[PDB]
Amino acid sequence: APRQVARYRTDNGEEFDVPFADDAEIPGTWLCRNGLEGTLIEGDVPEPKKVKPPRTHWDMLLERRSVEELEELLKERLDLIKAKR
Template identity: 50%
Template structure:
C-alpha cells in the first residue's frame, strides 16, 4: 500500500514559482491615527484614492489619516427632501386645505373610500 501512496506537495497556497523577474506594483504606506493617539500603517497602491478614515485591523477603531485635513461637509450634498417638502413645491397650503375639505365631503357622502367608512343615510318613510 505504501508504494501506491500519492506523493506531492501539501494542500494550501504554496507556489513553486520564484519571484525572480517579477516587478511589484508601486505602493505607498499610509499612516492613520486612532483617537487614543496610537498609529497604524496601511499599504496601498500609488494609484489608489486614499480614504480619510480607515478601520484599525487589530482594534476595530476608526483612525484618521495623519496629515489629512479635518473632515468638511460636502457643499455639493443636497439636503434631504421629505414628502411634505415635495408636496409644497407643487401646491400651496391653501390649495391643500381646499383639496382636503373636498375629499372629506366626498368620503362622508359615500362617493369615495371603503364602504365601512360611509355614513348611513337615514331612511325617510
C-alpha cells in the first residue's frame, strides 16, 4: 500500500510534495518547510475555517463610547478645524 503523493502551494508561489497515507485520507491544508500554510491543488477545499475577528482598537472604543457620544466628539473636532479657516 504505502504510496500516496500530494502537492501543496504556499502564498509565495513555492510548491511542496508530501508523500503519505496510501490507505487513508488527505488533509487540505499543510504546514510546509517554508513555514507557511499550504493548499492542495487537487481534491478540493473540503475544510472550513472559524475565522474569529482579531479584537481591534475600534472594538475597545465602541464598547465604552456610544455612537452618539462619538458623533458629538467628531463634531467638536470638525467645528474646530473650521475655526482655523
